[PDB]
Symmetry: C4
Subunit: 467 residues, 4 copies
């Protein structure tokens, strides 16, 4: 019961081969797997980029075609301030829709019945929504509101009545123009793909929910991709390459599972042996240590890779169009595959500084982060509610977190101060509070929190560095 | 006189319970208090954001309605350079005021007698201010000025004479157009609130105080919020939740006060005992140490929370409209409540690195800051007066401080240099001085001051870290 | 010969008083001197800001009055691309000059004979400069140039011939329009000052020196300030306060000189004594050490303060108008006065960390900087010549230095890369070189140079810190 | 066999002279070489800047002359959205070309036969490219495409038919307008150079490859520089100075080669001696160490300098016009020459901190970088494919690398987050992935990777610092 096997288990592939004539199959697979997974990622990215561009470019074209006086870059300030301006914008949108085929550079088809729920079979719906009862009378400081929402729709069919529109401004909530357009993404031919049919759902909103004398106007689109009914192109190895990637990932999965099982059985044998030699129920954290975390990482990376590859095959077969989910799966798998090659550098301590440090430092780092997180969250909520109405970088919780995290790393500091300087928070009290808030957060987190964090990490390194 | 009580006083809640069967009431209150205070903060923020948006959006609408040729973003460069331009801008403002009801998207009411002190009961006042005597004659290098200010006002009433305005350009100081508009913030219905009446005081200024051939034009508003006289909405737990928050905070206050008193009495007993056993008047800094700073922090946090909650109740009852003060109170209380939970991590030294370091390092840090502050203030004053006229980031003292503080953290460096590069300070001497100023400040504070500060903090950490 | 005097010389003011009943006159002067110098700086800054604003605002007004189609912010791209555009711009400038009094918001006077050297007594000179001989014939790839510059001027007098202007485009070098305007800076009355007469020399340049089909157009001004011949204002302590500042600075100067002399005499006595007791010519660096550098700093600060104060008196007396030099003197003196108060913190080692560190670290820091400076200068020259034509941040040597210095501190990195990304240097070779240049400079200086610099500074601190 | 020669070999120039009366010729050459190489670099930069400006300014002029409604700064958003807009832009370009001589401020000559391959001897070619067969019918979800590209060109000759252009929009790929213009860079006379003939190849592209309803329009130029056939200027030491630089560099090369040979021979002699005294084949890494890396650096720097100087002579002689390659050679040589002077500071250890540290730290640094590079590359590929379609900073691989490298140094953090905030990736899944990606990358690389890197560098410094 010398158990030299337990010695051969924790052996570098070079030592595993000098000792037992064992070809490093897993090491060779990783390099080939890295190459094939990265190549597959790039190949998918070609068509993914084509799709995203098509959607974005069409949206910009719609904004230039339907939004009166639209100019690039003014998406957040585009608004109407006069009754005449609002009427002109609405009528311009409808008129441009009605003459689209004669003007548009793209080849768009109308969608009969695409006007939405309010379009009773019409292509375009022009809905205005107002309170059921509204009697705003600021002169007498009096109002009488029935906040029930009434929807009034005008049906527009491509080849008028919509010109007779009268807007109830004093109680208007919003006006919307819903219509759908069909077009074919021909550019996919460059990738030797068959073009799909894209249906864009276009929603133009004139938003008066604030009743503030300023009515923002925006255009939004939703895209639906589907195979064309009758495609004909007079014109690859992509499917074969995806099958190859699946083969490599399946082989690596099999090898990793076999190694994990062998390690678990060795753990059981060792544990029962130590129970014989010394006392029983003696090993605990060690039973855990008998596992290889890198083999778990590889197993989960190749599972993600197989899922992404199957999804890529489905998208190319036109069974599904979820390019975002597939791109995310393939990119995460590529990153994990690149990371996995560090497993073979963990044997030589000269190249293993990063991982050894991480292993030593993570418990203290997590204990530190526990304390630092409550302070961070308190600051986040405080800033979000107090400064969010006044500060453009504190509008939402995620935005506040991004702002504070970038401030911790010394980024965009003066711009953060200047945002409050420019408007003074329309209240010296808010400005003074922002001064105290920003100075205290920056000083605390840059000089104490970050200094202590770094000190913990470098202390862990000093612990693993032999000197 | 073993005084195991003095042992039970400085005990962790887990130890306080394993020893005396004591339920950690304060620990449980903190979590519940955290939750309820944060929820209340968010709930208040809903309506606070509604109010701030209403004010800002109305101001933008006014700028588009009354400022001739106004475009978004040009607030600091909007100005007139010709007599005709100034006349056209003034007359455009008045004309737009006179036809407001027919054009405005918002529902505004005039305010008869709102023209201000210069409007003798008129709705709009159009005042021009000029020197009592002014005989500027640059051709003969001669002038004769009586700098007494004369105000001449034209009364405008909504349904002319103001068209006959003649401006004394050579001695004009400024022209102002004061009027008031009433509107109802209907959007508050989404929060199940009763809309208020907002009165906006609008002041348009054509400023010629510089006599420089360029007359900046700006629009400012003041807002006054009050309950409507006759509201009617055909349509919550907010008051009940505020009462709940008050209950939790009052209970925590009571517990903290009771604990503080118990600790003070224990301090007195211990001190008199040590006076018996050893010499008299022996304890000093220790008598102080017998206090818990966290219980003081909790007491002041719940006082702030109660004040903010009462103010929130008042605002919802429409007894007052001070959303900024209430928001500041609630946000500060939320931050303090989140911070207070670290009290229970100060018992375990593994999680107490930050606080222990702070405690060890603050005296040396403050002694260092004493010296660093005089240098910083000297630089601040120097930059403010020498570079403020030429540099857009040195305009005011607070702006100079923000600039220098962000420079210490390496932020917006090149933009700071480039501001002086672009104009060269219209004097090579000023440019050279700015070069020396910026290089010396940046080098000194980034490489010496900050290095020494960090070294002090990490030295304190090394002192409390057991290794 | 116990020389307790040499003990009393190196004594803190508190010790100097507990020992010899000596009131700390210098310590009290520093605080009062700080206060009065800062107040004087601010008071001067009021009028300095007024002057600078006047100049800048007038320049902007001129650009809007004389530059056809000018709009704020387009100062670097404002240019003509067509013969008609150039003619229209020139004629617009002249026409606006000719009707200035009827349109300008400022009160400007013409200057008869102000047209410059080319104006033979005329108010406006419109000069075009072209080669004496120019026969550019790109069709035959032939030219014949006599690069002698010929100046042709048209005289314009305010109440035509200039309308008959014909420009020799193929050989045109530039066109210039020179004229002068007089105006009175009335706003100075707010500071209770007598307004001065400002003469602006306006130069409009249509620059064709590049012969590139694009003719940049710019407006420049020079300002000359002088007292008005016949001022009359129907309407301070500033002179008295300046005399007070001079008094305080002179007293401090006297005390510092007396102390420096006493220290030098004590040095001589000690040195000769040590020559008696021990060998002769034994002391060297110590003779130097017997001097107080802070007393030298104070002496030079109060000299600067007196010079600045006398200059301020001169400017207020209207004997001179050099606000930039005076502002620089007063600001430097204010900074030095604030710094000087650290002298009294150098006695207590707890507050003297910064200065003691600096003293220990400066030799090693300077030896390090010697080596780092040659690398920095090599990079500066390389970047300036190779990348300056393509990169907007490398245009000039000072700009290159600012760019590299800010890069060392991690500032504006991505913008620096993106500048080269956007144009690709119109040559992949230049882009690749810029990649190597930026990556190598950033990596070297951030990770090695700065790390070593900080290590030297903190090592010096470790040397002076008692632990 | 005392071999004091081996002692005299590793001797500082001061010691080499105190011992053997040896004038430090190489040390003196370095200073003179530094001066002359830097001066030559600046002198070349004069003309290099002239050339680059000429090209850029002409390109901007062309964009203003030929692109309808072009305005500065809108290069990436300039596009057509309507059939009428596209026709107007095309016809405007052609019309402006046809009347160029009467309008252009520059003196341009037509190039007969310069229209390109599609111009059969014509000056201007106006080509439209469309699919051989295209039957896009989105209404029936059907298409029939023959993706063969058909080119149809219209020949335009300067002093119509091109007005009869009909564009097949449904199958249009792109339209291009190719023409050439000749002009003379007269500004070179300021450098006392003979102006060259520049031929600009202008390509205007209306790109419809995306078929997205938006057709970007761009103008590109290629420049060809050649000597004029018949130049005549009625009008330096540059060639003499270049010969001087060549002389200095050749002398330094000779001295460095002689020293390298002497060192190699000394290595051989020492090695064979040690083989006699002690065992044979004993020295290995030492034989390598017997070489001076600085002499290799100097040799390669002066080789680069000579190549650049010869190229500069060629360009001035008009035998070649490759200013970019010459500028790169001269700038790299200047940087290397400045760096080379550190060789004489490597003798004194007080000034040799940087180099000694680098020498000690490079092996550990490289081992660390090996591990860090796979993680970095994985992140780069992941970001490039997943976020590149949505994020403007992830468009290309080089751009992704610049973004991640600047993020490591804490640069442009909040802007990176905000880019994804603004559009939300049009998919909450993409936004969430970007959040995880950015947070994980920033945290890992700033807090662990960079901390460990710095710790390695400062540890190497601690190893070479005597304390
Ligand atoms: C226009 O206003 C109506 C009514 O205010 C909005 O309709 C609501 O939409 C939300 C989310 O789509 C639903 O949860 C509600 O049930 C709808 N009705 C009400 C009474 O709230 C509509 O969303 C607005 N349109 C746009 C484009 O914003
Ligand atoms: C227009 O100019 C007048 C006179 O210069 C300003 O009136 C002064 O305003 C300040 C602050 O409001 C008061 O302290 C003064 O008493 C007022 N009179 C004088 C003679 O100074 C007025 O503020 C200016 N208007 C605007 C909108 O700036
Ligand atoms: C960002 C990382 C590093 C460290 C220590 C600087 N740190 C904080 O400073 C506080 N803190 C958060 O709570 C947090 C939560 C989500 C995003 C970013 C942060 C964030 O910056 C922290 C705290 C908890 C978890 C991770 C971290
Ligand atoms: C900002 C904090 C950290 C530290 C040490 C970097 N530090 C300085 O560098 C000098 N300094 C001021 O005087 C100061 C005053 C107000 C705002 C910011 C500052 C500021 O940056 C300082 C000095 C005094 C009090 C606090 C601090
Ligand atoms: C800026 C300071 C700090 C330090 C060490 C970072 N450092 C360099 O990195 C190289 N370096 C110059 O040569 C230099 C010269 C002029 C302005 C800025 C610099 C500059 O950044 C340097 C070198 C010489 C003198 C001062 C310094
Ligand atoms: C930039 C230098 C310093 C250091 C250690 C921070 N480091 C990384 O963090 C990872 N890393 C790359 O892989 C890399 C490759 C190309 C450009 C920039 C980088 C880059 O930032 C790295 C890694 C390999 C080679 C050089 C370096
Ligand atoms: Na930055
Ligand atoms: Na930074």
């Amino acid at each position: 019961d010398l158990r030299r096997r337990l010695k051969y288990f924790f052996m570098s592939p070079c030592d595993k081969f000098r000792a037992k004539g064992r070809k490093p199959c897993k090491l060779m697979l990783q390099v080939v797997k890295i190459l094939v997974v990265t190549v597959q990622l790039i190949l998918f990215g070609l068509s993914n980029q084509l799709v995203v561009t098509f959607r974005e470019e069409n949206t910009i074209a719609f904004r230039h075609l339907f939004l009166l006086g639209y100019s690039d870059g003014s998406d957040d300030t585009f608004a109407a301030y006069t009754q005449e301006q609002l009427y002109q914008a609405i009528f311009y949108a409808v008129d441009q829709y009605l003459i689209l085929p004669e003007i548009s550079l793209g080849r768009y088809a109308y969608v009969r019945g695409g006007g939405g729920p309010w379009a009773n079979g019409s292509a375009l719906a022009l809905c205005q929504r107002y309170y059921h009862r509204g009697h705003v009378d600021p002169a007498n400081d009096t109002f009488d509101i029935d906040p029930r929402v009434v929807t009034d729709c005008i049906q527009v069919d491509p080849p008028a009545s919509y010109k007779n529109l009268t807007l109830k401004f004093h109680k208007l909530i919003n006006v919307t123009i819903h219509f759908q357009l069909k077009t074919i993404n021909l550019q996919s031919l460059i990738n030797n793909e068959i073009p799909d049919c894209y249906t864009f759902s276009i929603l133009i909103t004139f938003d008066n929910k604030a009743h503030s004398g300023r009515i923002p106007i925006r255009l939004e689109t939703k895209t639906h991709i589907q195979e064309c009914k009758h495609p004909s192109v007079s014109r690859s190895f992509r499917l074969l390459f995806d099958v190859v990637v699946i083969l490599t990932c399946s082989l690596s999965f099999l090898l990793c599972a076999r190694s994990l099982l062998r390690g678990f059985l060795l753990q059981n044998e060792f544990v029962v042996f130590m129970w014989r030699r010394r006392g029983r129920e003696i090993s605990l954290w060690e039973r855990l240590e008998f596992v290889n975390g890198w083999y778990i990482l590889l197993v989960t990376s190749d599972v993600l890779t197989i899922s992404g590859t199957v999804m890529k095959i489905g998208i190319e077969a036109k069974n599904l169009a979820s390019y975002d989910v597939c791109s995310i799966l393939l990119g995460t798998s590529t990153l994990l595959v690149w990371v996995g090659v560090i497993r073979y550098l963990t044997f030589f301590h000269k190249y293993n500084i990063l991982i050894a440090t991480l292993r030593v430092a993570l418990p203290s780092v997590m204990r530190f982060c526990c304390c630092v997180a409550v302070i961070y969250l308190g600051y986040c909520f405080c800033g979000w509610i107090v400064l969010g109405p006044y500060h453009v970088k504190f509008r939402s919780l995620s935005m506040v977190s991004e702002c504070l995290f970038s401030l911790i790393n010394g980024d965009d500091m003066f711009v953060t101060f200047a945002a409050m300087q420019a408007q003074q928070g329309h209240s010296s009290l808010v400005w003074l509070f922002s001064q105290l808030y920003l100075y205290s957060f920056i000083s605390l987190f840059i000089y104490m929190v970050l200094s202590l964090f770094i000190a913990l990490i470098t202390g862990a390194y000093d612990t693993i560095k032999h000197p």
